[PDB]
Amino acid sequence: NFNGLKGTGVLTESNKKFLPFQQFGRDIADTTDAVRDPQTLEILDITPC
Amino acid sequence: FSRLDKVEAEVQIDRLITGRLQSLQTYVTQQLIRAAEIRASANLAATKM
């Protein structure tokens, strides 16, 4: 869960650079594929295991 | 599921399951119709061979 966004998957450090105002990354299916951790401002890709 | 109960979530989910399932029966019908054209070609290619 990130900020209420429930899901299941494997988290890994992203090379994606979010701009200051983004919290979620979306794929072509509009599913959240990346997220900025709310305590430490670095980006995880979310992948189904 | 992040926001509704096991009583109204279902009333929404039922429409995602219906739509996405119809999106499969449509894709499978398209593949079966195309498979029949590739077969006509494969039968001509075997006859050319």
Side-chain angles (χ1 to χ4, degrees):
Chain A
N1 178 341
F2 288 84
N3 315 76
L5 183 98
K6 306 178 78 83
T8 293
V10 55
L11 316 180
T12 303
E13 291 86 344
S14 196
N15 69 326
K16 291 171 177 168
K17 298 186 180 75
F18 289 3
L19 283 57
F21 63 87
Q22 294 164 327
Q23 182 160 270
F24 302 116
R26 296 296 174 82
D27 69 358
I28 305 102
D30 198 14
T31 66
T32 292
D33 102 321
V35 67
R36 177 180 298 183
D37 170 63
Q39 291 103 313
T40 60
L41 288 290
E42 69 100 28
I43 312 308
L44 303 169
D45 278 291
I46 297 155
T47 286
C49 55
Chain B
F1 290 126
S2 302
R3 284 161 44 192
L4 303 184
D5 61 353
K6 215 179 300 288
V7 185
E8 292 296 335
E10 179 196 301
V11 181
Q12 302 304 290
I13 295 290
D14 180 51
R15 293 149 140 214
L16 267 60
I17 295 183
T18 301
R20 293 174 176 183
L21 183 59
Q22 218 88 319
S23 309
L24 291 171
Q25 310 313 287
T26 303
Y27 172 87
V28 177
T29 296
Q30 293 294 346
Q31 292 302 327
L32 283 170
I33 289 170
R34 210 185 315 243
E37 179 184 339
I38 297 289
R39 185 137 241 280
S41 188
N43 290 338
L44 177 62
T47 300
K48 297 255 181 174
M49 191 76 77

Coordinates of all heavy atoms in Angstrom, one line a residue:
Chain A
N1 N 0.8 -1.2 0.0 CA 0.0 0.0 0.0 C 0.9 1.2 0.0 O 1.7 1.4 0.9 CB -0.9 -0.1 1.2 CG -1.8 1.1 1.4 OD1 -1.6 2.1 0.9 ND2 -2.9 0.9 2.2
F2 N 0.7 2.2 -0.9 CA 1.3 3.5 -0.9 C 0.2 4.5 -0.9 O -0.5 4.6 -1.9 CB 2.2 3.7 -2.2 CG 3.5 2.9 -2.1 CD1 3.5 1.5 -2.5 CD2 4.7 3.5 -1.7 CE1 4.7 0.8 -2.5 CE2 5.9 2.8 -1.7 CZ 5.9 1.5 -2.0
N3 N 0.1 5.3 0.1 CA -0.9 6.4 0.2 C -2.4 5.9 0.0 O -3.2 6.6 -0.5 CB -0.6 7.6 -0.7 CG 0.8 8.0 -0.6 OD1 1.8 7.4 -1.2 ND2 1.1 9.1 0.0
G4 N -2.6 4.6 0.3 CA -3.9 3.9 0.0 C -4.0 3.1 -1.2 O -4.9 2.4 -1.4
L5 N -3.0 3.2 -2.1 CA -2.9 2.4 -3.3 C -2.5 0.9 -3.1 O -1.4 0.6 -3.2 CB -2.0 3.1 -4.3 CG -2.0 2.4 -5.7 CD1 -2.9 3.1 -6.8 CD2 -0.6 2.4 -6.3
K6 N -3.5 0.1 -2.8 CA -3.3 -1.3 -2.6 C -2.9 -2.0 -3.9 O -3.3 -1.6 -5.0 CB -4.6 -2.0 -2.0 CG -5.2 -1.3 -0.8 CD -6.5 -1.9 -0.3 CE -6.3 -3.2 0.5 NZ -5.9 -3.0 1.9
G7 N -2.1 -3.1 -3.7 CA -1.7 -3.9 -4.8 C -0.8 -5.1 -4.4 O -0.4 -5.2 -3.2
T8 N -0.4 -5.9 -5.3 CA 0.6 -7.0 -5.1 C 1.6 -7.0 -6.2 O 1.3 -6.9 -7.4 CB -0.2 -8.4 -5.1 OG1 -1.0 -8.5 -4.0 CG2 0.8 -9.6 -5.1
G9 N 2.9 -7.2 -5.9 CA 4.0 -7.2 -6.9 C 5.4 -7.0 -6.2 O 5.5 -7.0 -5.0
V10 N 6.4 -7.0 -7.1 CA 7.8 -6.8 -6.7 C 8.3 -5.4 -7.0 O 8.1 -4.9 -8.1 CB 8.7 -7.9 -7.3 CG1 8.6 -8.0 -8.8 CG2 10.2 -7.7 -6.9
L11 N 8.8 -4.7 -6.0 CA 9.3 -3.3 -6.1 C 10.8 -3.3 -6.4 O 11.5 -4.1 -5.9 CB 9.0 -2.6 -4.8 CG 7.6 -2.8 -4.1 CD1 7.4 -2.0 -2.8 CD2 6.4 -2.5 -5.1
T12 N 11.2 -2.4 -7.3 CA 12.6 -2.2 -7.6 C 12.9 -0.8 -8.0 O 12.1 -0.1 -8.5 CB 13.0 -3.2 -8.7 OG1 12.8 -4.5 -8.3 CG2 14.5 -3.1 -9.1
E13 N 14.1 -0.3 -7.7 CA 14.5 1.1 -7.9 C 14.5 1.5 -9.3 O 15.1 0.8 -10.2 CB 15.9 1.4 -7.3 CG 16.0 1.3 -5.8 CD 16.2 -0.1 -5.2 OE1 16.1 -1.1 -5.9 OE2 16.6 -0.2 -4.0
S14 N 13.9 2.6 -9.6 CA 13.7 3.1 -11.0 C 14.7 4.1 -11.4 O 15.1 4.9 -10.6 CB 12.3 3.7 -11.1 OG 11.9 3.8 -12.4
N15 N 15.0 4.1 -12.7 CA 15.8 5.2 -13.3 C 14.8 6.3 -13.8 O 15.3 7.3 -14.3 CB 16.6 4.7 -14.5 CG 15.9 4.1 -15.7 OD1 14.8 3.6 -15.6 ND2 16.4 4.3 -16.9
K16 N 13.5 6.1 -13.7 CA 12.5 7.2 -14.0 C 12.6 8.4 -13.1 O 12.6 8.2 -11.9 CB 11.0 6.6 -13.9 CG 10.6 5.6 -14.9 CD 9.3 5.0 -14.5 CE 8.9 4.0 -15.6 NZ 7.7 3.1 -15.2
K17 N 12.8 9.6 -13.7 CA 12.8 10.8 -13.0 C 11.4 11.5 -12.9 O 11.0 12.1 -13.9 CB 13.8 11.8 -13.6 CG 15.3 11.3 -13.6 CD 16.2 12.4 -14.2 CE 17.7 12.0 -14.2 NZ 18.0 11.1 -15.3
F18 N 10.7 11.4 -11.8 CA 9.5 12.2 -11.6 C 9.8 13.7 -11.4 O 10.7 14.0 -10.6 CB 8.6 11.7 -10.5 CG 7.9 10.3 -10.7 CD1 8.1 9.5 -11.8 CD2 7.1 9.8 -9.6 CE1 7.5 8.3 -11.9 CE2 6.5 8.6 -9.7 CZ 6.7 7.8 -10.9
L19 N 9.0 14.5 -12.0 CA 9.0 16.0 -11.7 C 8.4 16.2 -10.3 O 7.7 15.3 -9.8 CB 8.1 16.7 -12.8 CG 8.9 16.9 -14.1 CD1 9.4 15.6 -14.8 CD2 7.9 17.5 -15.1
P20 N 8.7 17.3 -9.6 CA 8.3 17.5 -8.2 C 6.9 17.2 -7.8 O 6.6 16.9 -6.7 CB 8.6 19.0 -7.9 CG 9.8 19.3 -8.9 CD 9.5 18.4 -10.1
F21 N 5.9 17.4 -8.7 CA 4.5 17.3 -8.4 C 3.8 16.0 -8.7 O 2.6 15.8 -8.5 CB 3.8 18.5 -9.2 CG 3.9 18.3 -10.7 CD1 3.0 17.6 -11.5 CD2 5.0 19.0 -11.4 CE1 3.2 17.4 -12.8 CE2 5.1 18.8 -12.8 CZ 4.2 18.0 -13.5
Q22 N 4.6 15.0 -9.3 CA 4.0 13.7 -9.6 C 4.2 12.7 -8.4 O 5.2 12.7 -7.7 CB 4.8 13.1 -10.8 CG 4.5 13.9 -12.1 CD 5.5 13.6 -13.2 OE1 6.7 13.3 -13.0 NE2 5.1 13.7 -14.5
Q23 N 3.2 11.8 -8.2 CA 3.3 10.7 -7.2 C 3.2 9.3 -7.8 O 3.8 8.4 -7.3 CB 2.3 10.9 -6.0 CG 2.5 9.8 -5.0 CD 1.9 10.3 -3.6 OE1 2.6 10.8 -2.8 NE2 0.6 10.1 -3.4
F24 N 2.5 9.2 -8.9 CA 2.3 7.9 -9.6 C 2.7 7.9 -11.1 O 2.4 8.9 -11.8 CB 0.8 7.5 -9.4 CG 0.4 7.4 -8.0 CD1 -0.6 8.2 -7.5 CD2 0.9 6.4 -7.1 CE1 -1.1 8.1 -6.2 CE2 0.5 6.3 -5.8 CZ -0.5 7.1 -5.3
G25 N 3.3 6.9 -11.5 CA 3.5 6.6 -13.0 C 2.4 5.6 -13.5 O 2.1 4.7 -12.8
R26 N 1.9 5.8 -14.7 CA 0.9 5.0 -15.4 C 1.4 4.4 -16.6 O 2.1 5.0 -17.4 CB -0.4 5.9 -15.6 CG -1.1 6.4 -14.4 CD -1.6 5.2 -13.5 NE -2.1 5.7 -12.3 CZ -3.3 6.2 -12.1 NH1 -4.2 6.3 -13.0 NH2 -3.7 6.5 -10.9
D27 N 1.0 3.2 -16.9 CA 1.3 2.5 -18.2 C 0.1 2.6 -19.2 O -0.9 3.3 -18.9 CB 1.6 1.0 -18.0 CG 0.5 0.1 -17.4 OD1 -0.6 0.5 -17.2 OD2 0.8 -1.1 -17.3
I28 N 0.2 2.0 -20.4 CA -0.8 2.1 -21.4 C -2.2 1.6 -21.0 O -3.2 2.1 -21.5 CB -0.2 1.3 -22.7 CG1 1.1 1.8 -23.1 CG2 -1.2 1.4 -23.9 CD1 2.3 0.9 -22.7
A29 N -2.2 0.7 -20.0 CA -3.4 0.2 -19.4 C -4.0 1.0 -18.2 O -4.9 0.6 -17.6 CB -3.2 -1.3 -19.0
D30 N -3.4 2.2 -18.0 CA -3.7 3.2 -16.9 C -3.5 2.5 -15.5 O -4.1 3.0 -14.6 CB -5.0 3.9 -17.2 CG -5.1 5.2 -16.3 OD1 -4.1 5.7 -15.8 OD2 -6.2 5.8 -16.3
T31 N -2.7 1.5 -15.4 CA -2.4 0.9 -14.1 C -1.1 1.6 -13.5 O -0.3 2.0 -14.3 CB -2.1 -0.6 -14.2 OG1 -1.0 -0.9 -15.0 CG2 -3.3 -1.4 -14.7
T32 N -1.1 1.7 -12.2 CA 0.1 2.4 -11.6 C 1.3 1.5 -11.7 O 1.4 0.4 -11.0 CB -0.2 2.8 -10.1 OG1 -1.1 3.9 -10.2 CG2 1.0 3.4 -9.4
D33 N 2.3 1.8 -12.5 CA 3.5 1.0 -12.8 C 4.7 1.5 -12.1 O 5.7 0.8 -12.0 CB 3.7 1.0 -14.3 CG 4.8 1.9 -14.9 OD1 4.9 3.1 -14.5 OD2 5.6 1.5 -15.8
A34 N 4.7 2.7 -11.5 CA 5.7 3.3 -10.6 C 5.2 4.2 -9.6 O 4.1 4.8 -9.8 CB 6.8 4.0 -11.5
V35 N 5.9 4.4 -8.5 CA 5.4 5.2 -7.4 C 6.6 5.9 -6.6 O 7.7 5.3 -6.5 CB 4.5 4.4 -6.4 CG1 5.3 3.3 -5.7 CG2 3.8 5.2 -5.4
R36 N 6.4 7.1 -6.1 CA 7.4 7.8 -5.3 C 7.1 7.5 -3.8 O 6.0 7.9 -3.3 CB 7.4 9.3 -5.6 CG 8.3 10.1 -4.7 CD 8.3 11.6 -5.1 NE 8.7 11.8 -6.4 CZ 8.8 13.0 -7.0 NH1 8.5 14.1 -6.2 NH2 9.1 13.2 -8.2
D37 N 8.0 6.8 -3.1 CA 7.9 6.5 -1.7 C 7.6 7.7 -0.9 O 8.3 8.7 -1.0 CB 9.1 5.7 -1.3 CG 9.1 5.5 0.3 OD1 8.2 4.8 0.8 OD2 10.0 6.0 1.0
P38 N 6.6 7.7 0.0 CA 6.2 9.0 0.7 C 7.1 9.4 1.7 O 7.2 10.6 2.0 CB 4.8 8.7 1.2 CG 4.7 7.2 1.3 CD 5.5 6.7 0.2
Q39 N 7.9 8.6 2.4 CA 8.9 9.0 3.4 C 10.2 9.4 2.7 O 10.8 10.5 3.1 CB 9.2 7.9 4.4 CG 8.1 7.6 5.3 CD 7.3 6.3 5.0 OE1 6.9 6.1 3.9 NE2 7.1 5.5 6.0
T40 N 10.8 8.6 1.7 CA 12.0 8.9 1.1 C 11.8 9.1 -0.4 O 11.3 8.2 -1.1 CB 13.0 7.8 1.4 OG1 12.7 6.5 1.0 CG2 13.4 7.7 2.9
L41 N 12.1 10.3 -1.0 CA 11.5 10.7 -2.3 C 12.2 10.1 -3.5 O 12.7 10.8 -4.4 CB 11.4 12.3 -2.3 CG 10.4 13.0 -1.5 CD1 9.0 12.8 -2.0 CD2 10.4 12.6 0.0
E42 N 12.3 8.8 -3.6 CA 12.8 8.0 -4.6 C 11.8 7.0 -5.2 O 10.7 6.7 -4.6 CB 14.1 7.3 -4.2 CG 13.9 6.1 -3.1 CD 13.9 4.7 -3.7 OE1 14.5 4.4 -4.7 OE2 13.2 3.8 -3.0
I43 N 12.0 6.7 -6.5 CA 11.0 6.1 -7.3 C 11.2 4.6 -7.4 O 12.2 4.1 -7.8 CB 10.9 6.7 -8.7 CG1 10.9 8.3 -8.6 CG2 9.7 6.2 -9.5 CD1 9.9 8.9 -7.7
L44 N 10.1 3.8 -7.1 CA 10.1 2.4 -7.4 C 9.3 2.1 -8.6 O 8.2 2.6 -8.8 CB 9.4 1.7 -6.2 CG 10.0 2.0 -4.8 CD1 9.1 1.5 -3.7 CD2 11.3 1.3 -4.7
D45 N 9.8 1.3 -9.5 CA 8.9 0.6 -10.5 C 8.2 -0.5 -9.7 O 8.8 -1.2 -8.9 CB 9.7 0.0 -11.7 CG 9.9 1.0 -12.8 OD1 9.0 1.5 -13.4 OD2 11.1 1.4 -13.0
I46 N 6.9 -0.8 -10.1 CA 6.1 -1.8 -9.6 C 5.9 -2.8 -10.7 O 5.5 -2.5 -11.8 CB 4.7 -1.3 -9.1 CG1 4.8 -0.3 -7.9 CG2 3.8 -2.5 -8.8 CD1 3.7 0.7 -7.9
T47 N 6.3 -4.1 -10.5 CA 6.2 -5.2 -11.5 C 5.4 -6.4 -10.9 O 5.7 -6.7 -9.7 CB 7.6 -5.5 -12.0 OG1 8.1 -4.5 -12.8 CG2 7.8 -6.8 -12.7
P48 N 4.5 -7.0 -11.6 CA 3.9 -8.3 -11.2 C 5.0 -9.3 -11.0 O 5.8 -9.5 -11.9 CB 2.9 -8.7 -12.2 CG 3.4 -8.0 -13.4 CD 4.0 -6.7 -13.0
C49 N 5.1 -10.0 -9.9 CA 6.1 -11.1 -9.7 C 5.7 -12.3 -10.6 O 4.6 -12.4 -11.1 CB 6.4 -11.4 -8.3 SG 5.0 -11.8 -7.1
Chain B
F1 N -11.3 -1.6 -5.1 CA -11.1 -2.3 -3.8 C -10.4 -1.5 -2.7 O -10.5 -1.8 -1.5 CB -10.3 -3.6 -4.1 CG -11.2 -4.6 -4.9 CD1 -10.7 -5.2 -6.1 CD2 -12.4 -5.2 -4.4 CE1 -11.4 -6.2 -6.8 CE2 -13.1 -6.2 -5.0 CZ -12.6 -6.7 -6.2
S2 N -9.7 -0.5 -3.1 CA -9.0 0.5 -2.2 C -10.1 1.4 -1.5 O -9.7 2.2 -0.7 CB -8.0 1.3 -2.9 OG -7.0 0.5 -3.5
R3 N -11.3 1.4 -2.1 CA -12.3 2.4 -1.7 C -13.8 2.0 -1.5 O -14.5 2.9 -1.0 CB -12.4 3.4 -2.8 CG -11.2 4.3 -2.8 CD -11.1 4.9 -4.1 NE -12.5 5.3 -4.6 CZ -12.7 5.6 -5.8 NH1 -11.7 5.7 -6.7 NH2 -13.9 6.0 -6.1
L4 N -14.2 0.9 -1.8 CA -15.6 0.4 -1.6 C -15.6 -1.0 -0.9 O -14.6 -1.8 -0.9 CB -16.3 0.3 -3.0 CG -16.3 1.6 -3.8 CD1 -17.1 1.4 -5.1 CD2 -17.0 2.8 -3.0
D5 N -16.7 -1.3 -0.3 CA -17.0 -2.5 0.4 C -17.3 -3.7 -0.5 O -17.6 -3.6 -1.7 CB -18.3 -2.3 1.3 CG -19.6 -1.9 0.6 OD1 -19.6 -1.6 -0.6 OD2 -20.6 -1.7 1.3
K6 N -17.4 -4.9 0.1 CA -17.7 -6.2 -0.6 C -19.2 -6.3 -1.2 O -19.6 -7.4 -1.4 CB -17.3 -7.4 0.2 CG -16.7 -8.6 -0.6 CD -16.3 -9.7 0.4 CE -15.2 -9.4 1.4 NZ -13.8 -9.2 0.8
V7 N -19.9 -5.2 -1.3 CA -21.3 -5.1 -1.6 C -21.5 -4.1 -2.7 O -22.3 -4.4 -3.6 CB -22.1 -4.6 -0.3 CG1 -23.6 -4.7 -0.6 CG2 -21.8 -5.6 0.9
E8 N -20.9 -2.9 -2.7 CA -20.9 -2.0 -3.9 C -19.7 -2.2 -4.8 O -19.8 -1.9 -6.0 CB -21.0 -0.6 -3.5 CG -22.4 -0.2 -2.9 CD -23.6 -0.4 -3.9 OE1 -23.4 -0.3 -5.1 OE2 -24.7 -0.6 -3.4
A9 N -18.5 -2.6 -4.3 CA -17.4 -3.0 -5.1 C -17.8 -3.9 -6.2 O -17.7 -3.6 -7.4 CB -16.2 -3.6 -4.4
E10 N -18.5 -5.0 -5.9 CA -19.1 -6.0 -6.8 C -19.9 -5.4 -7.9 O -19.8 -5.8 -9.1 CB -19.9 -6.9 -6.0 CG -20.6 -8.0 -6.8 CD -21.7 -8.7 -6.0 OE1 -21.5 -9.3 -4.9 OE2 -22.9 -8.7 -6.4
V11 N -20.7 -4.4 -7.6 CA -21.6 -3.7 -8.6 C -20.8 -3.0 -9.7 O -21.3 -2.8 -10.8 CB -22.7 -2.9 -7.9 CG1 -23.6 -2.2 -9.0 CG2 -23.5 -3.7 -7.0
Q12 N -19.6 -2.5 -9.3 CA -18.6 -1.9 -10.3 C -17.8 -3.0 -11.0 O -17.7 -3.0 -12.2 CB -17.7 -0.9 -9.5 CG -18.5 0.2 -8.8 CD -19.3 1.0 -9.8 OE1 -18.8 1.7 -10.7 NE2 -20.6 0.9 -9.7
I13 N -17.3 -3.9 -10.2 CA -16.4 -5.0 -10.7 C -17.1 -5.8 -11.8 O -16.5 -6.0 -12.8 CB -15.9 -5.9 -9.6 CG1 -15.0 -5.2 -8.5 CG2 -15.2 -7.1 -10.1 CD1 -13.6 -4.8 -9.0
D14 N -18.3 -6.1 -11.6 CA -19.1 -6.8 -12.6 C -19.2 -6.2 -14.0 O -19.3 -6.9 -15.0 CB -20.6 -6.8 -12.0 CG -21.5 -7.6 -12.9 OD1 -21.2 -8.7 -13.3 OD2 -22.6 -7.1 -13.2
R15 N -18.9 -4.9 -14.1 CA -18.9 -4.2 -15.3 C -17.5 -4.2 -16.0 O -17.4 -4.0 -17.2 CB -19.4 -2.8 -15.2 CG -20.9 -2.9 -14.9 CD -21.3 -1.7 -14.0 NE -22.6 -1.2 -14.4 CZ -22.9 0.1 -14.4 NH1 -22.1 0.9 -13.8 NH2 -24.1 0.5 -14.8
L16 N -16.5 -4.3 -15.2 CA -15.1 -4.5 -15.7 C -15.0 -6.0 -16.2 O -14.4 -6.2 -17.2 CB -14.1 -4.2 -14.6 CG -13.6 -2.8 -14.7 CD1 -14.7 -1.8 -14.5 CD2 -12.6 -2.5 -13.5
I17 N -15.5 -6.9 -15.4 CA -15.4 -8.3 -15.8 C -16.2 -8.5 -17.1 O -15.7 -9.1 -18.0 CB -15.9 -9.3 -14.7 CG1 -14.8 -9.1 -13.5 CG2 -15.9 -10.7 -15.2 CD1 -15.1 -10.0 -12.3
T18 N -17.4 -8.0 -17.2 CA -18.2 -8.1 -18.4 C -17.5 -7.4 -19.6 O -17.3 -8.1 -20.7 CB -19.6 -7.5 -18.3 OG1 -20.3 -8.1 -17.3 CG2 -20.5 -7.6 -19.6
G19 N -17.0 -6.2 -19.5 CA -16.4 -5.5 -20.6 C -15.1 -6.2 -21.1 O -14.9 -6.5 -22.3
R20 N -14.2 -6.5 -20.2 CA -12.9 -7.2 -20.5 C -13.1 -8.6 -21.0 O -12.4 -9.0 -22.0 CB -12.1 -7.2 -19.2 CG -11.7 -5.8 -18.8 CD -10.9 -5.7 -17.5 NE -10.5 -4.3 -17.2 CZ -9.8 -3.9 -16.2 NH1 -9.4 -4.7 -15.2 NH2 -9.3 -2.7 -16.2
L21 N -14.1 -9.3 -20.5 CA -14.4 -10.6 -21.1 C -15.0 -10.5 -22.5 O -14.6 -11.3 -23.3 CB -15.4 -11.3 -20.1 CG -15.8 -12.7 -20.5 CD1 -14.6 -13.6 -20.6 CD2 -16.7 -13.3 -19.5
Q22 N -15.8 -9.5 -22.8 CA -16.3 -9.3 -24.1 C -15.1 -8.9 -25.1 O -15.1 -9.3 -26.2 CB -17.4 -8.2 -24.1 CG -18.5 -8.5 -25.1 CD -19.6 -9.3 -24.5 OE1 -19.4 -10.3 -23.8 NE2 -20.9 -9.0 -24.8
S23 N -14.1 -8.2 -24.5 CA -12.9 -7.8 -25.2 C -12.0 -9.1 -25.5 O -11.3 -9.1 -26.5 CB -12.1 -6.8 -24.4 OG -12.9 -5.7 -24.0
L24 N -12.1 -10.1 -24.7 CA -11.5 -11.4 -25.1 C -12.3 -12.1 -26.2 O -11.7 -12.4 -27.2 CB -11.3 -12.3 -23.8 CG -10.2 -11.8 -22.9 CD1 -10.2 -12.6 -21.6 CD2 -8.8 -11.8 -23.5
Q25 N -13.6 -12.3 -26.0 CA -14.4 -13.1 -27.0 C -14.3 -12.4 -28.4 O -14.4 -13.1 -29.4 CB -15.9 -13.2 -26.6 CG -16.2 -13.7 -25.2 CD -15.4 -14.9 -24.8 OE1 -15.7 -16.0 -25.3 NE2 -14.5 -14.8 -23.9
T26 N -14.1 -11.1 -28.4 CA -13.9 -10.3 -29.7 C -12.5 -10.6 -30.3 O -12.5 -11.0 -31.4 CB -14.0 -8.8 -29.3 OG1 -15.3 -8.6 -28.8 CG2 -13.9 -7.9 -30.5
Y27 N -11.4 -10.5 -29.5 CA -10.1 -10.9 -29.9 C -9.9 -12.3 -30.4 O -9.3 -12.6 -31.4 CB -9.1 -10.6 -28.8 CG -7.7 -11.1 -29.1 CD1 -6.8 -10.3 -29.8 CD2 -7.3 -12.4 -28.6 CE1 -5.5 -10.8 -30.0 CE2 -6.0 -12.9 -28.9 CZ -5.1 -12.1 -29.6 OH -4.0 -12.7 -30.0
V28 N -10.6 -13.3 -29.7 CA -10.5 -14.7 -30.1 C -11.2 -14.9 -31.4 O -10.7 -15.6 -32.3 CB -11.0 -15.6 -29.0 CG1 -11.0 -17.1 -29.4 CG2 -10.1 -15.5 -27.8
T29 N -12.4 -14.3 -31.6 CA -13.1 -14.3 -32.9 C -12.3 -13.7 -34.0 O -12.2 -14.3 -35.1 CB -14.5 -13.6 -32.8 OG1 -15.3 -14.4 -31.9 CG2 -15.2 -13.6 -34.1
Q30 N -11.6 -12.6 -33.7 CA -10.7 -12.0 -34.7 C -9.5 -13.0 -35.0 O -9.3 -13.2 -36.2 CB -10.2 -10.6 -34.3 CG -11.2 -9.5 -34.2 CD -11.8 -9.2 -35.6 OE1 -11.3 -9.5 -36.7 NE2 -12.9 -8.4 -35.6
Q31 N -8.9 -13.6 -34.1 CA -7.8 -14.6 -34.3 C -8.3 -15.8 -35.1 O -7.7 -16.2 -36.0 CB -7.2 -15.0 -33.0 CG -6.3 -13.9 -32.4 CD -5.2 -13.4 -33.3 OE1 -4.6 -14.1 -34.1 NE2 -4.9 -12.1 -33.2
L32 N -9.5 -16.4 -34.8 CA -10.0 -17.5 -35.5 C -10.3 -17.1 -37.0 O -10.0 -17.9 -37.9 CB -11.4 -17.9 -34.8 CG -11.2 -18.7 -33.6 CD1 -12.5 -18.8 -32.9 CD2 -10.7 -20.1 -33.9
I33 N -10.9 -16.0 -37.2 CA -11.1 -15.4 -38.6 C -9.8 -15.2 -39.3 O -9.7 -15.4 -40.5 CB -12.0 -14.2 -38.5 CG1 -13.5 -14.6 -38.2 CG2 -12.0 -13.4 -39.8 CD1 -14.4 -13.4 -37.8
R34 N -8.7 -14.8 -38.6 CA -7.5 -14.6 -39.3 C -6.8 -15.9 -39.6 O -6.2 -16.1 -40.6 CB -6.7 -13.6 -38.6 CG -5.8 -12.8 -39.6 CD -4.9 -11.9 -38.8 NE -5.6 -11.2 -37.8 CZ -5.7 -9.9 -37.7 NH1 -5.2 -9.1 -38.7 NH2 -6.3 -9.3 -36.7
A35 N -6.7 -16.7 -38.6 CA -6.2 -18.1 -38.7 C -6.8 -18.8 -40.0 O -6.0 -19.4 -40.7 CB -6.5 -18.9 -37.5
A36 N -8.0 -18.6 -40.3 CA -8.6 -19.2 -41.5 C -8.0 -18.6 -42.8 O -8.0 -19.3 -43.8 CB -10.1 -19.0 -41.4
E37 N -7.6 -17.4 -42.8 CA -6.9 -16.8 -44.0 C -5.5 -17.2 -44.1 O -5.0 -17.5 -45.2 CB -7.0 -15.2 -43.8 CG -6.3 -14.4 -44.9 CD -6.4 -12.9 -44.7 OE1 -7.2 -12.4 -43.9 OE2 -5.6 -12.2 -45.3
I38 N -4.7 -17.3 -43.0 CA -3.4 -17.8 -43.0 C -3.4 -19.3 -43.4 O -2.5 -19.7 -44.2 CB -2.7 -17.6 -41.6 CG1 -2.6 -16.1 -41.2 CG2 -1.4 -18.3 -41.5 CD1 -1.5 -15.4 -42.0
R39 N -4.4 -20.0 -43.2 CA -4.5 -21.4 -43.6 C -4.8 -21.4 -45.0 O -4.2 -22.3 -45.6 CB -5.6 -22.1 -42.9 CG -5.6 -23.5 -43.2 CD -5.8 -24.4 -42.0 NE -4.6 -25.3 -41.7 CZ -4.4 -26.4 -42.4 NH1 -5.2 -26.8 -43.3 NH2 -3.3 -27.1 -42.1
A40 N -5.7 -20.7 -45.6 CA -5.8 -20.7 -47.0 C -4.5 -20.4 -47.7 O -4.2 -21.0 -48.7 CB -6.9 -19.6 -47.4
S41 N -3.7 -19.5 -47.2 CA -2.4 -19.2 -47.7 C -1.4 -20.4 -47.6 O -0.7 -20.7 -48.5 CB -1.8 -17.9 -47.1 OG -0.6 -17.6 -47.7
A42 N -1.4 -21.0 -46.4 CA -0.5 -22.1 -46.1 C -0.8 -23.3 -47.0 O 0.0 -24.0 -47.5 CB -0.6 -22.5 -44.7
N43 N -2.1 -23.6 -47.3 CA -2.6 -24.6 -48.2 C -2.2 -24.3 -49.7 O -1.8 -25.1 -50.4 CB -4.1 -24.8 -48.1 CG -4.5 -25.5 -46.8 OD1 -3.7 -26.2 -46.1 ND2 -5.7 -25.5 -46.5
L44 N -2.2 -23.0 -50.1 CA -1.7 -22.6 -51.4 C -0.2 -22.7 -51.5 O 0.3 -23.2 -52.5 CB -2.2 -21.1 -51.7 CG -1.6 -20.5 -53.0 CD1 -2.1 -21.3 -54.2 CD2 -2.1 -19.1 -53.2
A45 N 0.5 -22.3 -50.5 CA 2.0 -22.4 -50.4 C 2.4 -23.8 -50.4 O 3.4 -24.1 -51.1 CB 2.5 -21.7 -49.2
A46 N 1.7 -24.8 -49.8 CA 2.0 -26.2 -49.9 C 1.8 -26.7 -51.3 O 2.6 -27.5 -51.8 CB 1.2 -27.0 -48.9
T47 N 0.8 -26.2 -52.0 CA 0.4 -26.6 -53.4 C 1.4 -26.0 -54.4 O 1.9 -26.7 -55.3 CB -1.0 -26.2 -53.6 OG1 -1.8 -26.8 -52.7 CG2 -1.5 -26.6 -55.0
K48 N 1.9 -24.8 -54.1 CA 3.0 -24.2 -54.9 C 4.3 -24.9 -54.7 O 5.1 -25.2 -55.6 CB 3.2 -22.7 -54.5 CG 2.0 -21.8 -54.7 CD 2.2 -20.9 -55.9 CE 0.9 -20.0 -56.0 NZ 1.1 -19.0 -57.1
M49 N 4.6 -25.4 -53.5 CA 5.7 -26.2 -53.2 C 5.7 -27.5 -53.9 O 6.7 -27.8 -54.7 CB 5.8 -26.4 -51.7 CG 7.1 -27.0 -51.2 SD 8.4 -25.8 -51.2 CE 8.1 -24.9 -49.7

